[PDB]
Amino acid sequence: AAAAQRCGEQGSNMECPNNLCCSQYGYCGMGGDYCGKGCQNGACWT
């Protein structure tokens, strides 16, 4: 779906799943903006 797309605290406390990294601004993806230092949830590198 395209509704309720955000994650973490911006995402109404609904996280991305099983690996998918949640950026500091509340967006699901992979790499240094999502899995890097700002990570809220998912497979973070910390």
- Convert 11-29 into a string of H (helix), E (strand) and C (coil): CCCCCCCCCCEECCCCCEE
| C-alpha span between 43 and 33 (Å, rounded) | 12
Method for structure elucidation: NMR
Backbone φ, ψ for residue 19 (5° rounding): -175, -35
Q: Where are the domains of the chain?
A: 1-46
| C-alpha span between 18 and 16 (Å, rounded) | 7
| Top-level class of domain 1-46 | alpha beta
Q: Taking a C-beta distance cutoff of 8 angstroms, is the pair 40, 20 a contact?
A: no
Backbone φ, ψ for residue 14 (5° rounding): -110, 115
Task: Tell whether 14 is in a known binding site.
Answer: yes
